[PDB]
Amino acid sequence: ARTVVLITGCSSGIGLHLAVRLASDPSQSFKVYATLRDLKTQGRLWEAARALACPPGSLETLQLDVRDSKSVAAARERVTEGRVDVLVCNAGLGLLGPLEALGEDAVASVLDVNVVGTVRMLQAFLPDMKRRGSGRVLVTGSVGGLMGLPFNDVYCASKFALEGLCESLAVLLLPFGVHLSLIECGPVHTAGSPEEVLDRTDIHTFHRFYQYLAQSKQVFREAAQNPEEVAEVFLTALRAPKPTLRYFTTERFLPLLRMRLDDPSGSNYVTAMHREVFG
Amino acid sequence: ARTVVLITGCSSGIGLHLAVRLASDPSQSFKVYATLRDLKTQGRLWEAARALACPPGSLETLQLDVRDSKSVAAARERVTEGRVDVLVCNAGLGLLGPLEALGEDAVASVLDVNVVGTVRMLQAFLPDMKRRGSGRVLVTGSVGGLMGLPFNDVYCASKFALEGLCESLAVLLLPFGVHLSLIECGPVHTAGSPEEVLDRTDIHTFHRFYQYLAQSKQVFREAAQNPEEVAEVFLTALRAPKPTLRYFTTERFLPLLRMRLDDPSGSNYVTAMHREVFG
């Protein structure tokens, strides 16, 4: 059909739910280009697709390695309909642990994909949307991209980066009638070694790691959302006459987010979050 | 003397002012390791140093390429006093223009240095400060790291990244008695081609570029601060019994920063800043 969509990172989590959520819309108004990094993972996508009976030729597989400029280029050209009416920037990675234990090569990887990779999609897909004078860009945000979480230093870094990349472009894009919004997600219902962590860290840091790993499992269980609810914000947003900049899947997180805003110097939030995690 | 300091990026701007501001303190309590990327730029540093008569052996030159792990390693070892009582993470780069015109290789460069490079310093210097149970980390922040500025997409991205890297580490570091604060700077009094920009962009984007280049020159002239005032926040902060997370060199920027906090969805700030720059 019509709305030509190109989603990134669809081999699990939200991206996958998303493609199928759209591919199979009752109105049959979306064509979908679910992009996988590693093609030999199209399995799940297709299974779930077959389960909802998405009409044939409404979902398509494309491989796309965001850490590489040519792939982004190639992917762009396979969009036969010749436009990408809605672009959903979703590839993202994560990283847990005491900074000192994280390997350089890992940190590099996390920003290349999360940050740089996002920009590369934007580069290739912005122009024609400026050209045509219309289109929609959707970026998967997170609560970690609005406030720092102990032991997630680099993921948060990488999640704030997109917050800044997307708020700047907002201002400029305004008059072009090209839209960009971020979907502020939280825990969604989606699934290092102590020898190695401990090896590379001071035991007191390690005691706190453990302590934190213990606190998030709790938080997950009670705050975590049904993937089908997270994906529904996406469509709520790609259907607003004039969408906002941020869409928040949950509101649970607004209170800590507010008291972070009242005291810019930070000692309030740093303190509340500190005990909120430890004691 | 005593407080062993290691500043990064001291060949101009704030870092340079900083080293000399400290090297030459009347109390003679700081030893300084001004780090240059490119050593054949030690000139200015030394000139200004000679001008304030910093006592000999209170300032030292070290070369340090933040995009490289060994250099950081080597630099660490030349700190003969065997400790880095205060670490001032200051190397940073910038980037102006419509995203679509920015070359990949440039974007990579901006995050490797600003973000990754910061982390690499932290990696090497965090541990022993955790070990000793004391020390101070100072990071040069910016107003662009708290709100997006049109045409500065990637710099802002890269400046929010450190905001998130530093707020996360804050929480964890709390009990170790190791301190970390960011110096939220703005315009400080420190000094692409239209063929090429225009080549790679739609003329309407270009008209807006120009328009913006025109608005910031104005803003600079009236908001810009004497470098000696910016550097004085640094020492105000490395002397607080228990410092806060953020130190703001100016307050001019708080009003826009506040109305950004009241409406999380963003349409308020995006809008105000939009006209604030264009019309």
Ligand SMILES: C[C@]12CC[C@@H]3c4ccc(O)cc4CC[C@H]3[C@@H]1CC[C@@H]2O
């Ligand atoms: C950021 C997440 C939501 C917020 C979570 C939170 C929220 C509050 C809190 O006190 C602790 C944590 C720990 C784990 C966090 C999560 C890990 C990933 C998820 O997106």
Ligand SMILES: C[C@]12CC[C@@H]3c4ccc(O)cc4CC[C@H]3[C@@H]1CC[C@@H]2O
């Ligand atoms: C972010 C800076 C301070 C805030 C400035 C500003 C602040 C307000 C505004 O309406 C426009 C601009 C444009 C240039 C900006 C500056 C460029 C670098 C400087 O640090």
